[model samples]
Target: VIDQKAVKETLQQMLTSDQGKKFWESALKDPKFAESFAKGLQAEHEKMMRALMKDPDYQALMIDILKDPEMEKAMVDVLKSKEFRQHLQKVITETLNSPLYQAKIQDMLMKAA
Candidate 1:
């Protein structure tokens, strides 16, 4: 029979050893290793997004989150930040300067008349 306790202790020692730390640091420093890890994380994130989109409970939870006062206050604070204000103004300026946006505004005005 295999000694499960001995196996666990050996693995733990290996993981906690200085050489193990060096191995981890070197592996993490490699660009290929970082890219592979990031890709795996992104894949899992996309999978979770798809699953969340199909889940009714998740949808309801998100709706509740949007309605929460704490979230509203957080959003208000974020919107009031100088950086956010600058970004918002930039987006608005870009949109207003676009020919498509001007055309849509004219169309709305014509319909309102």
Candidate 2:
């Protein structure tokens, strides 16, 4: 009761169909699949980042970006903003109030003296 020709035609249609392409695109975007893809790339990505950091041209570009007046102005503006300052103070207060953080700070201070 098996028809090889019918099976072959159905497989060929699926492979050549727009629906198949949409299915693959959506599948790749799913969180589970995306996480797996990122985990697979992690090692290669780290190797690439190490190589990029070692490149003098990339270092020079980063320095230029930091030194640019517009970039400096933007950073200064952010630092001067009331909202930014409030968020920073909140984060600092929360961290300092934590028992673990206080113990870590005390240990560092003891070592320094």
Candidate 3:
């Protein structure tokens, strides 16, 4: 079962991150931004989750490290790195290039301009 308390705590902590702040500010200005952002992350997150779920060896390795504590911290730090964030942002931008999201992006640019 998912731990609601842990989820809430994590959400609270995330709200305080520079990344979270930037995401909200950008998203508020462009509603389509959040959808594109989520799609990009969900694609990778789902891919990794499925890969991990299907690979027995990977699952075993992951289980061994699940309690290491530092591993999660390191992963979070890596995810927050500018290079990784830029890559994710690129994915979102590309995703938004679809016709469905283009209007929102153009509107956002118009407002800013």
Candidate 4:
């Protein structure tokens, strides 16, 4: 418990400093670092989730959470608003217009050839 707090304290302080912020931001933003980091990290996350998905007991917990009436109430309450429809339309419009999506589709087309 003490070690956990100490680790977090130093981590928080390091990130709290300007140089640390700049260093971390550039580290993540750098293509070489970001590409390699994401490739490795994403696989780790995928495998972790893949392992979890195989467990029958843990799966029901998620299904039940979704089945909760309060969750359903929140979903419908949010869905019923005109604001939600407008928000979804704009989001969908932006998604369709995004260059990344275009690039992805273009890449898939090239794969067929």
Which parts of model 4 are misplaced by more than 4 Å? 1-18, 54-113
Return the TM-score for each candidate structure.
Answer: 0.38, 0.39, 0.35, 0.32
Q: Which stretches of candidate 1 lie over 4 Å from their true place?
A: 1-53, 100-113
1-113 per-residue lDDT for model 4 (tens digits):
57888889988898879989899798998899999988979978998988987898879887799779998898899898999999999999899779989888899999999
For each candidate, the alpha-carbon lDDT, in order, equals 0.91, 0.91, 0.85, 0.89
RMSD of each: 11.0, 14.2, 27.4, 21.0
For residues 5-103, what per-residue lDDT tens digits would candidate 1 score against the true structure? 888888889998999999989998999998888887997889988899789989998889887999999989998999999999999999998999999
RMSD of 1: 11.0
The segments of candidate 2 whose C-alpha lies over 4 angstroms from its true place after superposition are: 1-24, 68-113
Q: Which residue pairs clash within candidate 3?
A: none
Extract clashing residue pairs from model 1.
Answer: none
Please give, for residues 1-113, the per-residue lDDT of candidate 3 as tens digits.
Answer: 35788888888899999989997897767858767877868978988888877888988877779757898888889999999999999999888887879888898999999
